[PDB]
Ligand binder design. Structure first.
Ligand SMILES: COc1cc(O)c([C@@H](CC(=O)N2C[C@H](C)C[C@H](C)C2)c2ccc3c(c2)OCO3)c(OC)c1
Length: 228
C-alpha cells in the first residue's frame, strides 16, 4: 500500500464512525447538564435485576446494531470467508462497544449517559456487582483521560476486531494482511499528529478482553443475546 492510499485508508475509517456514532458527540456533550434526580435514581434502583439486563441488552443490541453497519463498510472485511469473517465480529464487537462508550463518559462527574440523561454507577445498583461496574467506569476513565478523539476511537476499534491471534481462524494468512495495513495506517497517522505518547498509555492488550469477557459471563445467566 502506498502513501496516497494509506492516506485514503485512514480517511475512510473515520468517515464511517461519524454516522455510526450512535449519538452525535455534538449532542453527547451538549446534554452534560441533564442529570437524573435522586428519585429518578432511586427509581432505577427499585427495579429488579431482570428488568435492567433486558434494558441493558436492549440498548446494547441496539448499539451493536450500529457497530456492524460501521464494521461492514471497511476494506478486506467482506473479502474474508464467513467463518473467519464472524469469529472476529463475534469475539470482537463487545470489546469495541466498551471502547465506544468512553464518549458517553463525563469524567467531570464520573457519570454516564443512559437513556436520555447522565447518571452515575449508582443508577445500576440493582445488578449487585458494583465492583465490576466501577471497574468499567475505571476503564472508561483511563480513556477519557487520554481524551480519545472521534478519529482516534475509530482507528483503534478498527484494530480490536482485526485480530489474527483469535483462535479458530482458517484464512489466517488473509487476516494478517488486513491487520498490518491497519496497524501501519494507525501508527503512521498518530505520527502525523504526534500522539504517539498514548501507545504506552493504551489500556493493556487483554484488559479490554478480560472486562468484556467478564461482562458476558455475569450476563450469560440472565440473557443470551448474540446478534449476528
Ligand atoms: C462505559 O462502558 C459501557 C459498556 C456498556 O456495555 C454499556 C451498556 C450497558 C451495560 O451493559 N452495562 C454493563 C454494566 C454492568 C452496567 C451498565 C448499565 C453498563 C450500554 C448501555 C446503554 C447504551 C449503550 C451501551 O449503547 C447505547 O446505549 C454502557 O452504557 C451504560 C457503558
Amino acid at each position: 500500500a502506498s502513501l496516497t492510499e494509506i492516506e485514503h485508508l485512514v480517511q475512510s475509517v473515520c468517515k464511517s464512525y461519524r454516522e455510526t456514532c450512535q449519538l452525535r458527540l455534538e449532542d453527547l456533550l451538549r446534554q452534560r447538564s441533564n442529570i437524573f434526580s435522586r428519585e429518578e435514581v432511586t427509581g432505577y434502583q427499585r427495579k429488579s435485576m431482570w428488568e435492567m439486563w433486558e434494558r441493558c441488552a436492549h440498548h446494547l443490541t441496539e448499539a451493536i446494531q450500529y457497530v456492524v453497519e460501521f464494521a461492514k463498510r471497511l476494506s478486506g472485511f467482506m473479502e474474508l470467508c464467513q467463518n473467519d469473517q464472524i469469529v472476529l465480529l463475534k469475539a470482537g464487537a463487545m470489546e469495541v462497544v466498551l471502547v465506544r462508550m468512553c464518549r458517553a463518559y463525563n469524567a467531570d462527574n464520573r457519570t454516564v449517559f443512559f437513556e436520555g440523561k447522565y447518571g452515575g454507577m449508582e443508577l445500576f445498583r440493582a445488578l449487585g456487582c458494583s465492583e465490576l461496574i466501577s471497574s468499567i467506569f475505571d476503564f472508561s476513565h483511563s480513556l477519557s483521560a487520554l481524551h480519545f478523539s472521534e478519529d482516534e476511537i475509530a482507528l483503534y476499534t478498527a484494530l480490536v476486531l482485526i485480530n489474527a491471534h483469535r483462535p479458530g481462524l482458517q484464512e489466517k494468512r488473509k487476516v494478517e494482511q488486513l491487520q498490518y495495513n491497519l496497524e501501519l495506517a494507525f501508527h503512521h497517522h498518530l505520527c502525523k499528529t504526534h500522539r504517539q505518547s498514548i501507545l504506552a498509555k493504551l489500556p493493556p492488550k487483554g484488559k479490554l478482553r478480560s472486562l468484556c469477557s467478564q461482562h458476558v459471563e455475569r450476563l450469560q445467566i440472565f440473557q443470551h443475546l448474540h446478534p449476528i
